[PDB]
Design an enzyme around this catalytic site. Structure first.
Site, PDB file in Angstrom:
ATOM      1  N   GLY A  10       9.623  -0.665 -22.893  1.00  0.00           N
ATOM      2  CA  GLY A  10      10.313  -1.334 -21.853  1.00  0.00           C
ATOM      3  C   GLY A  10      11.422  -0.573 -21.144  1.00  0.00           C
ATOM      4  N   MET A  13      12.153   6.316 -18.297  1.00  0.00           N
ATOM      5  CA  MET A  13      12.386   7.694 -18.690  1.00  0.00           C
ATOM      6  C   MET A  13      12.363   8.583 -17.449  1.00  0.00           C
ATOM      7  SD  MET A  13      10.299   9.838 -21.515  1.00  0.00           S
ATOM      8  CE  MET A  13      10.770  11.468 -22.048  1.00  0.00           C
ATOM      9  N   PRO A  14      13.400   9.371 -17.192  1.00  0.00           N
ATOM     10  CA  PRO A  14      13.342  10.315 -16.042  1.00  0.00           C
ATOM     11  C   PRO A  14      12.204  11.300 -16.214  1.00  0.00           C
ATOM     12  CG  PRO A  14      15.585  10.028 -16.827  1.00  0.00           C
ATOM     13  CD  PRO A  14      14.679   9.464 -17.897  1.00  0.00           C
ATOM     14  N   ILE A  15      11.427  11.465 -15.139  1.00  0.00           N
ATOM     15  CA  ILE A  15      10.254  12.346 -15.164  1.00  0.00           C
ATOM     16  C   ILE A  15      10.569  13.823 -15.172  1.00  0.00           C
ATOM     17  CG2 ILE A  15       8.743  10.564 -14.247  1.00  0.00           C
ATOM     18  CD1 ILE A  15       8.609  12.037 -11.681  1.00  0.00           C
ATOM     19  N   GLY A  17      13.327  16.515 -16.893  1.00  0.00           N
ATOM     20  CA  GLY A  17      14.407  16.786 -17.832  1.00  0.00           C
ATOM     21  C   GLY A  17      14.649  18.268 -17.957  1.00  0.00           C
ATOM     22  N   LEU A  18      15.778  18.595 -18.616  1.00  0.00           N
ATOM     23  CA  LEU A  18      16.159  19.974 -18.912  1.00  0.00           C
ATOM     24  C   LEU A  18      15.757  20.341 -20.336  1.00  0.00           C
ATOM     25  CD1 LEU A  18      17.802  22.517 -17.932  1.00  0.00           C
ATOM     26  CD2 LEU A  18      19.694  21.531 -19.244  1.00  0.00           C
ATOM     27  N   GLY A  19      14.971  21.390 -20.474  1.00  0.00           N
ATOM     28  CA  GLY A  19      14.669  21.942 -21.792  1.00  0.00           C
ATOM     29  C   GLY A  19      15.808  22.798 -22.324  1.00  0.00           C
ATOM     30  N   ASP A  44      16.124  17.463 -23.138  1.00  0.00           N
ATOM     31  CA  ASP A  44      15.229  17.594 -24.277  1.00  0.00           C
ATOM     32  C   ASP A  44      15.853  18.550 -25.303  1.00  0.00           C
ATOM     33  OD1 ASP A  44      12.424  17.110 -25.453  1.00  0.00           O
ATOM     34  OD2 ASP A  44      12.719  19.315 -25.635  1.00  0.00           O
ATOM     35  N   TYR A  49      16.314  23.804 -32.767  1.00  0.00           N
ATOM     36  CA  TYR A  49      16.783  24.744 -31.755  1.00  0.00           C
ATOM     37  C   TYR A  49      18.170  25.307 -32.040  1.00  0.00           C
ATOM     38  CZ  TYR A  49      12.916  22.614 -29.019  1.00  0.00           C
ATOM     39  OH  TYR A  49      11.703  22.077 -28.603  1.00  0.00           O
ATOM     40  N   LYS A  78      14.228  15.568 -31.824  1.00  0.00           N
ATOM     41  CA  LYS A  78      13.009  15.672 -32.606  1.00  0.00           C
ATOM     42  C   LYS A  78      13.365  15.909 -34.077  1.00  0.00           C
ATOM     43  CE  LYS A  78      11.111  18.120 -28.574  1.00  0.00           C
ATOM     44  NZ  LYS A  78      12.229  19.016 -28.233  1.00  0.00           N
ATOM     45  N   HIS A 111       8.470  16.173 -34.454  1.00  0.00           N
ATOM     46  CA  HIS A 111       8.370  17.429 -33.684  1.00  0.00           C
ATOM     47  C   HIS A 111       6.978  18.051 -33.779  1.00  0.00           C
ATOM     48  CE1 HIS A 111      11.054  20.941 -32.260  1.00  0.00           C
ATOM     49  NE2 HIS A 111       9.873  21.063 -31.708  1.00  0.00           N
TER      50      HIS A 111
HETATM   51  N1  LIG Z   1       7.842  19.841 -28.613  1.00  0.00           N
HETATM   52  C1  LIG Z   1       7.640  21.143 -28.807  1.00  0.00           C
HETATM   53  O1  LIG Z   1       7.025  21.619 -29.774  1.00  0.00           O
HETATM   54  C2  LIG Z   1       8.177  22.087 -27.776  1.00  0.00           C
HETATM   55  C3  LIG Z   1       9.103  21.637 -26.833  1.00  0.00           C
HETATM   56  N2  LIG Z   1       9.501  22.504 -25.831  1.00  0.00           N
HETATM   57  C4  LIG Z   1      10.541  21.968 -24.866  1.00  0.00           C
HETATM   58  O2  LIG Z   1      10.115  22.319 -23.559  1.00  0.00           O
HETATM   59  C5  LIG Z   1      11.141  23.110 -22.909  1.00  0.00           C
HETATM   60  C6  LIG Z   1      10.527  23.987 -21.838  1.00  0.00           C
HETATM   61  O3  LIG Z   1       9.604  24.945 -22.437  1.00  0.00           O
HETATM   62  P1  LIG Z   1       9.997  26.476 -22.726  1.00  0.00           P
HETATM   63  O4  LIG Z   1       9.046  26.922 -23.759  1.00  0.00           O
HETATM   64  O5  LIG Z   1      11.461  26.606 -23.001  1.00  0.00           O
HETATM   65  O6  LIG Z   1       9.648  27.269 -21.391  1.00  0.00           O
HETATM   66  P2  LIG Z   1       9.561  27.021 -19.795  1.00  0.00           P
HETATM   67  O7  LIG Z   1       8.113  27.024 -19.455  1.00  0.00           O
HETATM   68  O8  LIG Z   1      10.423  25.901 -19.427  1.00  0.00           O
HETATM   69  O9  LIG Z   1      10.119  28.424 -19.286  1.00  0.00           O
HETATM   70  C7  LIG Z   1      11.516  28.784 -19.546  1.00  0.00           C
HETATM   71  C8  LIG Z   1      11.687  30.171 -18.972  1.00  0.00           C
HETATM   72  O10 LIG Z   1      11.488  30.138 -17.535  1.00  0.00           O
HETATM   73  C9  LIG Z   1      12.616  30.719 -16.867  1.00  0.00           C
HETATM   74  N3  LIG Z   1      12.822  29.977 -15.633  1.00  0.00           N
HETATM   75  C10 LIG Z   1      13.265  28.693 -15.509  1.00  0.00           C
HETATM   76  N4  LIG Z   1      13.330  28.270 -14.248  1.00  0.00           N
HETATM   77  C11 LIG Z   1      12.884  29.353 -13.542  1.00  0.00           C
HETATM   78  C12 LIG Z   1      12.748  29.544 -12.159  1.00  0.00           C
HETATM   79  N5  LIG Z   1      13.076  28.590 -11.263  1.00  0.00           N
HETATM   80  N6  LIG Z   1      12.327  30.776 -11.757  1.00  0.00           N
HETATM   81  C13 LIG Z   1      12.017  31.707 -12.662  1.00  0.00           C
HETATM   82  N7  LIG Z   1      12.120  31.624 -13.974  1.00  0.00           N
HETATM   83  C14 LIG Z   1      12.569  30.406 -14.376  1.00  0.00           C
HETATM   84  C15 LIG Z   1      13.759  30.566 -17.867  1.00  0.00           C
HETATM   85  O11 LIG Z   1      14.740  31.587 -17.603  1.00  0.00           O
HETATM   86  P3  LIG Z   1      16.335  31.339 -17.698  1.00  0.00           P
HETATM   87  O12 LIG Z   1      16.586  30.302 -18.745  1.00  0.00           O
HETATM   88  O13 LIG Z   1      16.815  32.727 -18.046  1.00  0.00           O
HETATM   89  O14 LIG Z   1      16.778  30.901 -16.316  1.00  0.00           O
HETATM   90  C16 LIG Z   1      13.052  30.789 -19.199  1.00  0.00           C
HETATM   91  O15 LIG Z   1      12.885  32.180 -19.470  1.00  0.00           O
HETATM   92  C17 LIG Z   1      11.816  23.809 -24.088  1.00  0.00           C
HETATM   93  O16 LIG Z   1      13.057  24.419 -23.763  1.00  0.00           O
HETATM   94  C18 LIG Z   1      11.925  22.653 -25.094  1.00  0.00           C
HETATM   95  O17 LIG Z   1      12.986  21.796 -24.657  1.00  0.00           O
HETATM   96  C19 LIG Z   1       8.962  23.754 -25.716  1.00  0.00           C
HETATM   97  C20 LIG Z   1       8.071  24.220 -26.649  1.00  0.00           C
HETATM   98  C21 LIG Z   1       7.692  23.397 -27.721  1.00  0.00           C
HETATM   99  O1  LIG Z   2       8.511  24.193 -31.768  1.00  0.00           O
HETATM  100  C1  LIG Z   2       9.195  24.225 -30.718  1.00  0.00           C
HETATM  101  O2  LIG Z   2       9.723  23.230 -30.141  1.00  0.00           O
HETATM  102  C2  LIG Z   2       9.418  25.570 -30.028  1.00  0.00           C
HETATM  103  O3  LIG Z   2       9.153  26.661 -30.895  1.00  0.00           O
HETATM  104  C3  LIG Z   2      10.020  26.847 -31.939  1.00  0.00           C
HETATM  105  C4  LIG Z   2      11.384  26.558 -31.870  1.00  0.00           C
HETATM  106  C5  LIG Z   2      12.210  26.923 -32.928  1.00  0.00           C
HETATM  107  F1  LIG Z   2      13.519  26.644 -32.820  1.00  0.00           F
HETATM  108  C6  LIG Z   2      11.742  27.538 -34.067  1.00  0.00           C
HETATM  109  C7  LIG Z   2      10.402  27.815 -34.123  1.00  0.00           C
HETATM  110  C8  LIG Z   2       9.512  27.452 -33.102  1.00  0.00           C
HETATM  111  C9  LIG Z   2       8.053  27.726 -33.253  1.00  0.00           C
HETATM  112  S1  LIG Z   2       7.548  29.141 -33.969  1.00  0.00           S
HETATM  113  N1  LIG Z   2       7.259  26.784 -32.839  1.00  0.00           N
HETATM  114  C10 LIG Z   2       5.831  26.833 -32.948  1.00  0.00           C
HETATM  115  C11 LIG Z   2       5.300  26.000 -34.074  1.00  0.00           C
HETATM  116  C12 LIG Z   2       6.118  25.397 -35.047  1.00  0.00           C
HETATM  117  C13 LIG Z   2       5.582  24.631 -36.053  1.00  0.00           C
HETATM  118  C14 LIG Z   2       4.182  24.434 -36.131  1.00  0.00           C
HETATM  119 BR1  LIG Z   2       3.493  23.231 -37.401  1.00  0.00          BR
HETATM  120  C15 LIG Z   2       3.361  25.055 -35.221  1.00  0.00           C
HETATM  121  C16 LIG Z   2       3.931  25.803 -34.192  1.00  0.00           C
HETATM  122  F2  LIG Z   2       3.132  26.385 -33.291  1.00  0.00           F
END
Ligand SMILES: NC(=O)C1=CN([C@@H]2O[C@H](COP(=O)(O)OP(=O)(O)OC[C@H]3O[C@@H](n4cnc5c(N)ncnc54)[C@H](OP(=O)(O)O)[C@@H]3O)[C@@H](O)[C@H]2O)C=CC1
Ligand SMILES: O=C(O)COc1cc(F)ccc1C(=S)NCc1ccc(Br)cc1F
Length: 316
Positions: A10, A13-15, A17-19, A44, A49, A78, A111
């Site tokens: 209910g 969620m903003p479409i 977000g900042l990673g 996020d 992290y 997470k 996670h």
């Molecule tokens: N649930 C999960 O297992 C996971 C969750 N995530 C989440 O998703 C988020 C996003 O994914 P992530 O893997 O970090 O990578 P992204 O695909 O978001 O890419 C991040 C990279 O892109 C660069 N960048 C950002 N904006 C631009 C732009 N406008 N032009 C050029 N380069 C740009 C950044 O550089 P800079 O920062 O130097 O500007 C950084 O090096 C993560 O930070 C995390 O919050 C990610 C992986 C796994």
């Molecule tokens: O996981 C993130 O959000 C971003 O990535 C990470 C973020 C961290 F802070 C530390 C490790 C990871 C790694 S290595 N993640 C990949 C990963 C972890 C666990 C399992 Br199950 C499989 C897998 F593919």
């Protein structure tokens, strides 16, 4: 576009977000402050992290400054794999809450589906390099997540990196109390995820796309790897729309009814990435971007591939 999507709890969620994965602790406080100042309302986060305290400093300052109200923010974190234990879930959530300076999370995700042995190490390994599993399964961990809702610590619960059959398991859990609100998965033009996305969407789960830019800062990147940001076919779509390639890559999942969480610590890029509400990709653009799928993943990890719940053996 409408800026928020309705979840099955209910809440909205903003479409966009900042990673925060890989955002250095000495840069992420400013990144989050800038993000909130330029309009971001969703951050996020994750305990693994190692930067939630610094994210929290930013959130708290902007709340104190009355730039935003708490109700207008959507903060996600997470549960890490070493805390899939009935008796550890609450404390893990509470540590994240204490670090982020919050009294609730908007969304708390499992996670990864895989539980690991508890302890100090985030990736406990045996002497041969394999991760050491936990015996606790995704259903018992889910019950623990449900308790967090009932204790007021989190408004919504969900999952991350769950494959089709793992989502189904959750949905088919005996005595299920709360459905997952979200499945957060890797998604971009080279890993388009059509099958998993249709499954989740058909069940009313909202999908969040992570690594939408292809995570060029991932620590295991290699030279020869494909590069979304440098793909001239994507650059051409961007030029046609007078947008950057990153802006196209962010708008793409938005038009698939996904949430998307690009990461940056660069102030100018944080702003660039938010300016994605004043153009539309055509259906032809969308289908063309989907055509670039190659089943390529940023996030995978060899040390975890024998875990019985490792998600990427299944097709989707
Ligand atoms: N649930 C999960 O297992 C996971 C969750 N995530 C989440 O998703 C988020 C996003 O994914 P992530 O893997 O970090 O990578 P992204 O695909 O978001 O890419 C991040 C990279 O892109 C660069 N960048 C950002 N904006 C631009 C732009 N406008 N032009 C050029 N380069 C740009 C950044 O550089 P800079 O920062 O130097 O500007 C950084 O090096 C993560 O930070 C995390 O919050 C990610 C992986 C796994
Ligand atoms: O996981 C993130 O959000 C971003 O990535 C990470 C973020 C961290 F802070 C530390 C490790 C990871 C790694 S290595 N993640 C990949 C990963 C972890 C666990 C399992 Br199950 C499989 C897998 F593919």
């Amino acid at each position: 576009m409408a800026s928020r999507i309705l979840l099955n709890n209910g809440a909205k969620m903003p479409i966009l977000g900042l990673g925060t994965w890989k955002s250095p602790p000495g840069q992420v406080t400013e990144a989050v402050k800038v993000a909130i100042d330029v309009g971001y309302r969703h951050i996020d986060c994750a305990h693994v992290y190692q930067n939630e305290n610094e994210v929290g400093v930013a959130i708290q300052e902007k709340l104190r400054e009355q730039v935003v109200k708490r109700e207008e923010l959507f903060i996600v974190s997470k549960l890490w794999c070493t805390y899939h234990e009935k008796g550890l879930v609450k404390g893990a959530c509470q540590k994240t809450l204490s670090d982020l300076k919050l009294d609730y999370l908007d969304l708390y995700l499992i996670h990864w589906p895989t539980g690991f042995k508890p302890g100090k190490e985030f990736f406990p390994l045996d002497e041969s390099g394999n991760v050491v599993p936990s015996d606790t399964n995704i259903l018992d961990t889910w019950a623990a997540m449900e308790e967090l809702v009932d204790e007021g610590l989190v408004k919504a619960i969900g999952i991350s990196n769950f494959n089709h059959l793992q989502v189904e398991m959750i949905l088919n859990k005996p005595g299920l109390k709360y459905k997952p609100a979200v499945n957060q998965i890797e998604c971009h033009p080279y890993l388009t995820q059509e099958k998993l996305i249709q499954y989740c969407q058909s069940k009313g789960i909202v999908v969040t796309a992570y690594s939408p830019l292809g995570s060029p800062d991932r620590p295991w990147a290699k030279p020869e790897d494909p590069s979304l940001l440098e793909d001239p076919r994507i650059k051409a779509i961007a030029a046609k729309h007078n947008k950057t390639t990153a802006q196209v890559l962010i708008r793409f999942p938005m038009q698939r009814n996904l949430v998307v969480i690009p990461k940056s610590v660069t102030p100018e890029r944080i702003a660039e990435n938010f300016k994605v509400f004043d153009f539309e990709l055509s259906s032809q653009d969308m289908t063309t971007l989907l055509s670039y799928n190659r089943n390529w993943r940023v996030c995978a990890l060899l040390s975890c591939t024998s875990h019985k719940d490792y998600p990427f053996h299944e097709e989707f």
